Write an enzyme that holds these catalytic residues in place. Sequence first.
Site, PDB file in Angstrom:
ATOM      1  N   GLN A 197      -9.532 -21.767   3.154  1.00 46.16           N
ATOM      2  CA  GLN A 197      -9.043 -20.618   2.398  1.00 46.16           C
ATOM      3  C   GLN A 197      -8.160 -19.728   3.262  1.00 46.16           C
ATOM      4  O   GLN A 197      -7.050 -19.352   2.861  1.00 46.16           O
ATOM      5  CB  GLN A 197     -10.224 -19.823   1.840  1.00 46.16           C
ATOM      6  CG  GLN A 197      -9.913 -18.361   1.563  1.00 46.16           C
ATOM      7  CD  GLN A 197     -10.886 -17.735   0.587  1.00 46.16           C
ATOM      8  OE1 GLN A 197     -11.369 -18.392  -0.334  1.00 46.16           O
ATOM      9  NE2 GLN A 197     -11.182 -16.456   0.786  1.00 46.16           N
ATOM     10  N   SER A 250      -9.642 -21.167  10.168  1.00 48.97           N
ATOM     11  CA  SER A 250     -10.691 -20.226  10.527  1.00 48.97           C
ATOM     12  C   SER A 250     -11.864 -20.971  11.147  1.00 48.97           C
ATOM     13  O   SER A 250     -12.288 -22.012  10.637  1.00 48.97           O
ATOM     14  CB  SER A 250     -11.172 -19.435   9.305  1.00 48.97           C
ATOM     15  OG  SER A 250     -11.586 -20.306   8.265  1.00 48.97           O
ATOM     16  N   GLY A 262     -16.266 -23.767   7.293  1.00 50.59           N
ATOM     17  CA  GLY A 262     -16.644 -25.117   7.678  1.00 50.59           C
ATOM     18  C   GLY A 262     -15.486 -26.090   7.585  1.00 50.59           C
ATOM     19  O   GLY A 262     -15.295 -26.932   8.466  1.00 50.59           O
ATOM     20  N   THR A 263     -14.699 -25.990   6.511  1.00 50.48           N
ATOM     21  CA  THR A 263     -13.485 -26.790   6.408  1.00 50.48           C
ATOM     22  C   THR A 263     -12.518 -26.451   7.533  1.00 50.48           C
ATOM     23  O   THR A 263     -12.104 -27.330   8.299  1.00 50.48           O
ATOM     24  CB  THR A 263     -12.821 -26.561   5.050  1.00 50.48           C
ATOM     25  OG1 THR A 263     -13.750 -26.863   4.002  1.00 50.48           O
ATOM     26  CG2 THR A 263     -11.584 -27.437   4.906  1.00 50.48           C
ATOM     27  N   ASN A 310     -10.989  -9.758  12.512  1.00 50.34           N
ATOM     28  CA  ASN A 310     -10.852  -9.082  11.228  1.00 50.34           C
ATOM     29  C   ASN A 310     -11.208  -7.605  11.341  1.00 50.34           C
ATOM     30  O   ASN A 310     -10.494  -6.749  10.806  1.00 50.34           O
ATOM     31  CB  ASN A 310     -11.729  -9.771  10.185  1.00 50.34           C
ATOM     32  CG  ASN A 310     -11.100 -11.043   9.648  1.00 50.34           C
ATOM     33  OD1 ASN A 310      -9.879 -11.189   9.631  1.00 50.34           O
ATOM     34  ND2 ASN A 310     -11.938 -11.968   9.196  1.00 50.34           N
ATOM     35  N   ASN A 362      -2.706 -10.702   5.925  1.00 52.72           N
ATOM     36  CA  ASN A 362      -1.829 -11.851   5.717  1.00 52.72           C
ATOM     37  C   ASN A 362      -0.484 -11.667   6.399  1.00 52.72           C
ATOM     38  O   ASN A 362       0.025 -12.582   7.029  1.00 52.72           O
ATOM     39  CB  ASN A 362      -1.634 -12.100   4.224  1.00 52.72           C
ATOM     40  CG  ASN A 362      -2.745 -12.930   3.623  1.00 52.72           C
ATOM     41  OD1 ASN A 362      -3.598 -13.448   4.339  1.00 52.72           O
ATOM     42  ND2 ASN A 362      -2.739 -13.063   2.300  1.00 52.72           N
ATOM     43  N   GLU A 415       7.649 -23.774  26.657  1.00 54.56           N
ATOM     44  CA  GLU A 415       7.512 -22.779  27.717  1.00 54.56           C
ATOM     45  C   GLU A 415       6.291 -21.892  27.502  1.00 54.56           C
ATOM     46  O   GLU A 415       5.703 -21.405  28.475  1.00 54.56           O
ATOM     47  CB  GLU A 415       8.779 -21.930  27.810  1.00 54.56           C
ATOM     48  CG  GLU A 415      10.066 -22.741  27.781  1.00 54.56           C
ATOM     49  CD  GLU A 415      11.288 -21.913  28.126  1.00 54.56           C
ATOM     50  OE1 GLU A 415      11.356 -21.394  29.260  1.00 54.56           O
ATOM     51  OE2 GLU A 415      12.180 -21.780  27.262  1.00 54.56           O
TER      52      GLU A 415
HETATM   53  N1  LIG Z   1      -8.084 -12.614   8.523  1.00 52.28           N
HETATM   54  C1  LIG Z   1      -8.382 -13.197   7.365  1.00 52.28           C
HETATM   55  N2  LIG Z   1      -9.424 -14.099   7.306  1.00 52.28           N
HETATM   56  C2  LIG Z   1      -9.738 -14.702   6.136  1.00 52.28           C
HETATM   57  C3  LIG Z   1      -9.019 -14.421   4.983  1.00 52.28           C
HETATM   58  N3  LIG Z   1      -9.543 -15.155   3.977  1.00 52.28           N
HETATM   59  C4  LIG Z   1     -10.568 -15.891   4.465  1.00 52.28           C
HETATM   60  N4  LIG Z   1     -10.708 -15.611   5.799  1.00 52.28           N
HETATM   61  C5  LIG Z   1     -11.696 -16.200   6.719  1.00 52.28           C
HETATM   62  O1  LIG Z   1     -12.488 -17.132   6.014  1.00 52.28           O
HETATM   63  C6  LIG Z   1     -13.858 -16.957   6.301  1.00 52.28           C
HETATM   64  C7  LIG Z   1     -14.668 -17.255   5.048  1.00 52.28           C
HETATM   65  O2  LIG Z   1     -14.926 -18.639   4.956  1.00 52.28           O
HETATM   66  P1  LIG Z   1     -13.754 -19.686   4.604  1.00 52.28           P
HETATM   67  O3  LIG Z   1     -12.843 -19.939   5.782  1.00 52.28           O
HETATM   68  O4  LIG Z   1     -12.980 -19.170   3.414  1.00 52.28           O
HETATM   69  O5  LIG Z   1     -14.563 -21.023   4.219  1.00 52.28           O
HETATM   70  P2  LIG Z   1     -14.084 -21.976   3.013  1.00 52.28           P
HETATM   71  O6  LIG Z   1     -12.623 -21.780   2.690  1.00 52.28           O
HETATM   72  O7  LIG Z   1     -14.956 -21.745   1.804  1.00 52.28           O
HETATM   73  O8  LIG Z   1     -14.327 -23.458   3.589  1.00 52.28           O
HETATM   74  P3  LIG Z   1     -15.831 -24.006   3.751  1.00 52.28           P
HETATM   75  O9  LIG Z   1     -16.665 -22.997   4.503  1.00 52.28           O
HETATM   76  O10 LIG Z   1     -15.816 -25.316   4.496  1.00 52.28           O
HETATM   77  O11 LIG Z   1     -16.403 -24.213   2.369  1.00 52.28           O
HETATM   78  C8  LIG Z   1     -14.012 -15.520   6.761  1.00 52.28           C
HETATM   79  O12 LIG Z   1     -14.928 -15.438   7.828  1.00 52.28           O
HETATM   80  C9  LIG Z   1     -12.630 -15.112   7.225  1.00 52.28           C
HETATM   81  O13 LIG Z   1     -12.599 -15.051   8.630  1.00 52.28           O
HETATM   82  C10 LIG Z   1      -7.968 -13.515   5.034  1.00 52.28           C
HETATM   83  O14 LIG Z   1      -7.323 -13.257   4.019  1.00 52.28           O
HETATM   84  N5  LIG Z   1      -7.652 -12.903   6.231  1.00 52.28           N
END
Ligand SMILES: Nc1nc2c(ncn2[C@@H]2O[C@H](COP(=O)(O)OP(=O)(O)OP(=O)(O)O)[C@@H](O)[C@H]2O)c(=O)[nH]1
Lengths: 426, 426, 422
Positions: C11, C130, C134-135, C196, C218, C244
Site C-alpha cells: 500500500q 514499507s 508484510g507485502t 512517519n 506522499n 556516485e
Molecule cells: N509514510 C507513509 N506510510 C504509509 C502510507 N500508507 C501506508 N504506509 C505504511 O504502511 C504500513 C501499514 O501496512 P501496509 O504497508 O499498508 O501493509 P499492507 O499494504 O496491507 O501489506 P500486508 O501487510 O502484507 O498485508 C504503515 O506502517 C505505514 O508505515 C502513507 O501514505 N505514508
Amino acid sequence: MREIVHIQAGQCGNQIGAKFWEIISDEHGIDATGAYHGDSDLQLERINVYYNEASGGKYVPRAVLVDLEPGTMDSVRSGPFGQIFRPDNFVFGQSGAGNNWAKGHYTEGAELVDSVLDVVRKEAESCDCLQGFQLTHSLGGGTGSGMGTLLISKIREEYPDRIMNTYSVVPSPKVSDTVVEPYNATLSVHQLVENTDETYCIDNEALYDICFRTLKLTTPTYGDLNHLVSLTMSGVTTCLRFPGQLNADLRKLAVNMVPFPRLHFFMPGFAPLTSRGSQQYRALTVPELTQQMFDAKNMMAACDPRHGRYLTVAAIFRGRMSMKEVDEQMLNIQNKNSSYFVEWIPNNVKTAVCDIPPRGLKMSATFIGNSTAIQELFKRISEQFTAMFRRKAFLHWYTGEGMDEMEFTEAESNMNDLVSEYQQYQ
Amino acid sequence: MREIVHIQAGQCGNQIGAKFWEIISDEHGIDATGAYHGDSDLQLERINVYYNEASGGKYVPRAVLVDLEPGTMDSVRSGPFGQIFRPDNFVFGQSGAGNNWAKGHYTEGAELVDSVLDVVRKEAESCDCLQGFQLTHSLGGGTGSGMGTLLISKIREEYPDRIMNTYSVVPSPKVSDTVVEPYNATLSVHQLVENTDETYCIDNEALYDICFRTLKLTTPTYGDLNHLVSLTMSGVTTCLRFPGQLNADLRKLAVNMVPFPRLHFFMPGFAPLTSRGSQQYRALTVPELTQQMFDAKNMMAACDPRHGRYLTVAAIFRGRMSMKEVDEQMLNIQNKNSSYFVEWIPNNVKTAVCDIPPRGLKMSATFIGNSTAIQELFKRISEQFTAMFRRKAFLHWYTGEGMDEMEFTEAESNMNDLVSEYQQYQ
Amino acid sequence: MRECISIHVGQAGVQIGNACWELYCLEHGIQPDGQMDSFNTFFSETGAGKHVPRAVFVDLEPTVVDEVRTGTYRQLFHPEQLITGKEDAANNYARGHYTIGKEIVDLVLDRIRKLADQCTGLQGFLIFHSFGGGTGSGFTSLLMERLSVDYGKKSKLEFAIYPAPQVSTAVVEPYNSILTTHTTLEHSDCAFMVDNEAIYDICRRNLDIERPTYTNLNRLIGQIVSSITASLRFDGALNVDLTEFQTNLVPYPRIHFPLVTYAPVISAEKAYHEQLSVAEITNACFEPANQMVKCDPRHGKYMACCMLYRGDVVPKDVNAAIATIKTKRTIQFVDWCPTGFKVGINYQPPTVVPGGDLAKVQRAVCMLSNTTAIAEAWARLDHKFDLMYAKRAFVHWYVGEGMEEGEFSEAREDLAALEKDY
Ligand SMILES: Nc1nc2c(ncn2[C@@H]2O[C@H](COP(=O)(O)OP(=O)(O)OP(=O)(O)O)[C@@H](O)[C@H]2O)c(=O)[nH]1
Ligand SMILES: Nc1nc2c(ncn2[C@@H]2O[C@H](COP(=O)(O)OP(=O)(O)OP(O)(O)=S)[C@@H](O)[C@H]2O)c(=O)[nH]1
Ligand SMILES: Nc1nc2c(ncn2[C@@H]2O[C@H](COP(=O)(O)OP(=O)(O)OP(O)(O)=S)[C@@H](O)[C@H]2O)c(=O)[nH]1
C-alpha cells in the site's frame, strides 16, 4: 491570561473557597454582587486570572463548586457574596459518601465525574490560557478526598503539562474525627504521589493553636481558619495577580520547590499575625517578621521542622522596602539556622516580592518552606494504618464498594517508600 | 472480493446476525428490501463483501441462518428487513436440543450438518474469493454451541487456510440460566482450542452493566445488546469494507493478536458510549476516548484486566484526525499503564484507522485487546465443572446421546492446560 | 539518453509511486491521459504525444491498485503495469515472501525485464515499500535479490517506510523489519529513512498543518525523490549519477543506510515570511529537528554529507556556506573521513502542486548523509525484538508458513553484528 480554575470539594473546601472569593473581592475591589469599585488600576488590570468577562461591567469568580450534598451548597449560596456565582457552577450530589473514600470515588463519584469534567473543560476552553489549577478539600473527609483524587487523575490524564497545587486538609493527629479517616488519607496520598505536581499540607491543630495563642483568642472558630487560609491564598497568588519588582507565579514556586517528583509536599506559611494591642506596640519591620518566619509557634502543619531538616525555603513579600535588607536577613537566617537547614542546598531561600500589599496590611509575608518534618506525620499515619488494618476493622464498607486487599497493600507500600526516601534525604 | 459468509446459531445468534444486517444496511445505504440508496460511492464500492450480485439492482446479505426450531426463524423473517434474505438461507430443525450440547451436535446435528455444509459451500463457490468466516452463537445454550463446534470443525477440515473469528456468547458467571450450561461451555471451548483460529469472548453481565450505568438506562433489553454487538461488528469489519489511510483486515488482526495457536481468546471493545445529555456536553475528542479505551466500566467480557496483564492491544479508529496524536496517546497509555501492561511486548498497541465513520457518529472506536483476565473466567468454569461433575449429576442426558467419561476428562484437562499456559504467561 | 525503473510494493509503495508519478507528470506538463527529451528518463515515446510511466504496481491486496485504477489518471497509466493480488500477507514477512510472493514474482520479474529491454540506458532501479507491511517487506526483499541475481552490479535504490520507534501499525513489525533487513542487507545498495511521526511533527510545527493527511507524506517522498532525480532529469553545473551516490556513502558494504532530509518545508503564507539564502537554509536543515528522522545525529559521528541544490544557487556561496558549516562544533566527522563532501547543482527549480502544503519556490536543497544515530534506532529495534521474541510470541504465524525459529535467531545476531560494526 494565565487563568486559574478553582474547584472545591467537601464542606470545608467549599467554605474555604468561598472565603477566598470574598477576600479576592476585597483585594480586587469587587463588591458583594460583582461590580468593580477599586481605587487603583492594579486591582482590575489582572482581574481576568480569577474572574471572567461578564456583561454589564461585572465579574464572576472562576470557581467550580462540587459536593455530594446540598446542605453546604445552600448555606454558601445564601451566605455573603452568594450572588457573585452563577447557578451553573453549583453541581451537587444527593447521597453523600458519609466520610468514605471508596463511596465518593466510585459509587457516587461515577455520576459526578462527568459533571465536574464538563464544567472544568468549559472553564478551560472559555478562557484564554489556563496557567494551572487550585483545589481545596479535606483528607480527613471521605468524599472530599475522593473528589480530589478523581479530579487530579482526570486533570493529569487531560492536561499533563499544566501544573497545579492542591490545598488538602490533612486530619489532625490529636483528634480522630472519623474512624475511617486513615483510609481516606491513605488513598488520597496514594493518588497524590501520582496525580499532583505539588501539594501543601494544612493541618488543623496547628492553626487551632495559632488562633488560640498567637492571635490570643479564647473562642477559635472556622472563620479565623478560613481567614488565614485566604491570607495564604493571597500570599501565594499575589505575585501572579499583582505587579512586582520580582515577578513570580505558581510555576516559579513549583520549579523552586520540587527536587524529586515524589518529593512535593510543603507546609505554607503566613506572617505577621498580631492582635490589636500588640500591633500598635510591635515593630512593623522586617526583623519582626524574620523572627516569625522560622518558629514552631506560627507553624502550619503539625510537625516540627527542628527535628528534621529544611529542604528549601520560599519567601514572598508585599510592601515598601529594599531588597538588600531581605537578602542580608536571609543570609543571617542561614548563618544562625545552619543546623536546622540543609548543608548541601546552599542559598536555599527563594526570594521574591510583590509590590502590592494586601488590603488592610502594609506587609504580609507568606512562608513557603519544605522540611523533612512531614516524615513524622507520614510515619505516624502509616503505623496507624498498620495498627487498625492488622485487625481488619471497618473494611466491610470499602470492600462493599469494589475494594481489594493488596491494593491497600501497595498503597501502604507507597507511603513506606515515600517516608523511606524522605528519611534518606534527612 | 474477500467475501465473508455469516452463519448464525441459536436464537441469540440469529437475533445478533439480523441486527448486524440492518446495521450494515444502514452503513452501506441499503433499504429494508435491498435497494441501494447511499449518498456516497464508498458505501457501494465494497458492497460485495457482505452482499451478492442480485438482479434488478438489488443486494442480499451473505448470511446463513441455522436453528433447531423455527420459532425465532419466523420472528426474524417477519421482523424488520426480513425480505432482504432469500428463503433458501433459512434452514431449520424441528426437535430442538433443549440446551444440550450432545443432542445438538450428534442427535439433531446429524441431519443438519449436510444442509449447513451444502449452504456454506454454495456461498463459498458462488463468490469470488472467500476471505474468511464469521459465526455467532451462545456457549450458554446447548444447541448453538454444538452447531458452532460442528461448523468450525467442518470449516477446519474443509478450508484449513481460510481464517475466521467466532463471536461466541459465554454464559454469565453471576446467573446460571441453564443447569447443564457448564457442559456446553466445556465442550465448546474444547472444540474452540482446536477448530478456531481466534475467538472473541462476549459475556452478558458486562454489557448488561454497561447499558445500566454507562448508557444510563433503567430498562436494559436485548435490543441494546444487539446494537452494541452490531457496533463491534462494524468496528472490526470497517477496515476491510471501507477505504482507509491505514487499511486493515481480519487477517491483520489475527496476525497481530495470536502469539500461540492455543492463545487466541480476546475480549472486543467499543467507544464512545454516551447518552443525549452527556454527548452534547462531553468532549468529542480523542482523549475522551483514550480514557475510555482502558477501563473496567466500559468493559466487555466480565473479567478485570487489572488483575492480569494485557497481551497486546489493537485500536481501530473512524473519523477525521491525524495520526500522530493517536501514536502519542498510545505512548502515554503505555507510560501510565505500564504495570497493567506486559513488559516483554514493547509497543503492543496495534494502530489502524478506517477513514469512513459509522452512520450517525463522526467517531467510533473498537478496542481489540487481549489480557490474562480471561484466566479467572476459565479457572472458575473449570472449578465449577469439577464441582458438579464430582457428583455425576445430569450426566444421563449426555450419556444417552453417545457420551463418555474420559472424554470429559480430557476436555477438562485441556482447559487445565490452557489456564496453566495463560498463568505461565502472566 | 537513459532511463530508470521505479518499483512499488504494498500500500505504501503504491501510494508513493503514484505520488512520484504525479510529480513527474505535473512537472513536465503531462495531462492525465499522457500528452501536452529529459522526460524520457521516466516515460516512453510511442505513437503521438504519448508517455507512460516506467513502473510496476504490485501488491498482495488489490485495494490500492483498485484505488489507483479509479483515479483520473487511468489513461496515464498502462493497465498492464498494475498487478492485483488476492491474499495480503497482513504484516507477515514470511507470508508475502513464500506463500503468495513466490508464485507472482515471475510475471513482475519478467516484464520489468522487458522494461529494461526497451531502456538500454537503464541507470538504476527505484524501490518504494514499507518494512511494516508484510507485502512491502517480503515481496520487496525477494524481488530485490531477484534484481541482484538478474542484473549483477546494476545500481538499485530503495525507499523503505521504516516503522517509527513509537509508531507501529502492527505489533509484529519487529519480525518483518529484522527479517527483511537481514535478507536484503547484502544486496541493498542504498536504503533511506522514513519516520512517519517525524513527518507529522515537522508538518505540524514547520508547515503548521494541525490536521495533515497522508498526501503530505506522499509529496514528502515525492519532493525527496524529485530532488534526488533532478540531476538525471535536468542538467546542472555538476550533475550527480546514481552510481556516485553509492560510491560516496558505501566504502564498506555493511553500512549503506543513509538518512534523508529536505529544506525547506514552508507554506505559502510562511513563504511570504521567509526567502531562502544558502547559509540559513543549510544550517536549518542540519538542525536535528528539521530532519525527518527521529534520531538525533549529534549522538554519534557523521559519515559524509551530500548537497543537492536545485535552482539559482551560486557554487561560491555553496562553498562558503558549507565551510562555515564545517567550522562549527555542532558538526563532527570521523577521523578517517575528513573530506566526504559532494555537491550537486541543478538549474531546475523545485516544482509545486496546486493545493499542496509546499510553497512554489525557485530554489531548494536536499540534505543527504549517513549519521551514526541510525545505530540508536537499530539497537532499540533489536532490543524490542529480543523482548518480544524472548517469550517467542507470534512465531507460530511464521511457523505456519513452514520454518522453525533458527533463521529468526541468526537474523537477530546478524543485525546485532551490523549494530556493533559502528
Ligand atoms: N509514510 C507513509 N506510510 C504509509 C502510507 N500508507 C501506508 N504506509 C505504511 O504502511 C504500513 C501499514 O501496512 P501496509 O504497508 O499498508 O501493509 P499492507 O499494504 O496491507 O501489506 P500486508 O501487510 O502484507 O498485508 C504503515 O506502517 C505505514 O508505515 C502513507 O501514505 N505514508
Ligand atoms: N479549617 C476548617 N476546617 C473545617 C471546616 N469545616 C470542616 N472542617 C474540618 O474538616 C473535617 C471534616 O471534613 P469534611 O469535608 O466535612 O468531610 P466530608 O467527607 O466532606 O463530610 P461529608 O460531606 O461526607 S458528610 C473535620 O475534621 C473538620 O475539622 C472549616 O470550615 N474550616
Ligand atoms: N445479548 C443477547 N443475549 C441473548 C439474546 N437472546 C438470548 N440471549 C442469551 O443467550 C442465552 C441462551 O442461549 P440460547 O441461544 O437461547 O440457547 P439455545 O440452546 O439456542 O436454546 P434452545 O434453542 O435449545 S431452546 C441466555 O443466557 C440469554 O441471556 C439476545 O437477543 N441478546
